[PDB]
Amino acid sequence: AESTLGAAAAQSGRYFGTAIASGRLSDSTYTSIAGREFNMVTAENEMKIDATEPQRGQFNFSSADRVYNWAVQNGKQVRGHTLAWHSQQPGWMQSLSGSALRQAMIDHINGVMAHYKGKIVQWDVVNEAFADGSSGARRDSNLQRSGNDWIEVAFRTARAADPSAKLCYNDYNVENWTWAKTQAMYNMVRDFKQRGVPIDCVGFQSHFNSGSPYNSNFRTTLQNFAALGVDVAITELDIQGAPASTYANVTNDCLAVSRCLGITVWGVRDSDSWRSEQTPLLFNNDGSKKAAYTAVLDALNG
C-alpha cells in the first residue's frame, strides 16, 4: 500500500491529478500538499484562449509557463486545457465569423502546440460542443456557425502539430449512459473512427451534483466508449458535499475499465474550488484530510 494519492494510483499504471492556479503558488500549504499528493497537473485558466493569445498573432505564455514549470520541477506530467471553446474567447476572436474565424482557430492551435511540442501528454482539443437538454444538438457559438466540420478540423490540425500528444474531446453532463447528450457524443466518436478523424481520448468532466447526479451506469458509459477505440479519463471531478461513498464508487469505476487512464480532481482544498460553497473536494480549508480522502486512498490500494 502507498500513502499518497498519486503513488497509490501509479501502482495500477494510472495517475491522480489536480487543477493548479498560478495565483495560489505563493501559499505554502497549497504548494506542499499539491506537491506531495498528485502526479498530474492541469492549469485551471492559464492555457485558455484569452490567456495565451490576447491579441491576434501575439502569444503570451508567461502564466502558462509558470504552471508548466512548477509541474515539471515537482515531478508531474501535464494535461493541456483547452484549444477550442465557445467560452473565454478574447474580444478579437468573438468578432470573427466564417472562414476568417476558421483560419484564426487553426493559427491558435498551431501556435500554442508548437510552444509545448513533445512536453504535454494529453490535450483537451475541443471543449463543451454539445447543448444541454433532450435534443442532442450542438451548442450555438461562432465556431459552430462556421460549419458542422469545425470539430474535425481542430482534431486534424492538432494531430499534425504534435503527433506525440493524446488528443481528447472533453465535456460535462455526459456521464449517464441514458442521457441524450451522452448519446450525441457517442455517435460523434463512432463517426470519427469510421472516417479516420484523429481522436485518442474522451474526457468526462464528472461535475456531480444534485442536478447531475452520479449513477452506477457510469461504468457502462466508460466501457462502451473504450470499446470504440479511445482511452477515457475523468478530467474535472468534484462532488457536492464530498460523500465518501460516491468518491469511492467513481474511483472503482475507473479501476474496472482497462483504458481508464486516471482521475483529476478540480482543485486542492474546498476553498480553492470554483464551487467552494458546495464543499466538494478532498481536503479541508486548513489542509487536513476529509473522510472522502481516506475512501479514495483505500480504493486505490485495493
UniProtKB/Swiss-Prot annotation:
Keyword annotations: Carbohydrate metabolism, Disulfide bond, Glycosidase, Hydrolase, Lectin, Polysaccharide degradation, Secreted, Signal, Xylan degradation
Any one Gene Ontology BP term: xylan catabolic process
Reactions catalysed, as given in the entry: Endohydrolysis of (1->4)-beta-D-xylosidic linkages in xylans
Keyword field contains Aminoacyl-tRNA synthetase: no
Domain GH10: 1-299
Compartment(s): Secreted
Secreted in keyword set: yes
Entry EC number(s): 3.2.1.8
Pathway: Glycan degradation; xylan degradation
Single GO molecular function: endo-1,4-beta-xylanase activity
Active site: 128, 236
GO cellular component, as recorded: extracellular region
Main localisation: secreted
Role this protein plays: Contributes to hydrolyze hemicellulose, the major component of plant cell-walls. XLNA and XLNB seem to act sequentially on the substrate to yield xylobiose and xylose as carbon sources.
Family classification: Belongs to the glycosyl hydrolase 10 (cellulase F) family.
Protein name according to UniProt: Endo-1,4-beta-xylanase A
Species per Swiss-Prot/TrEMBL record: Streptomyces lividans
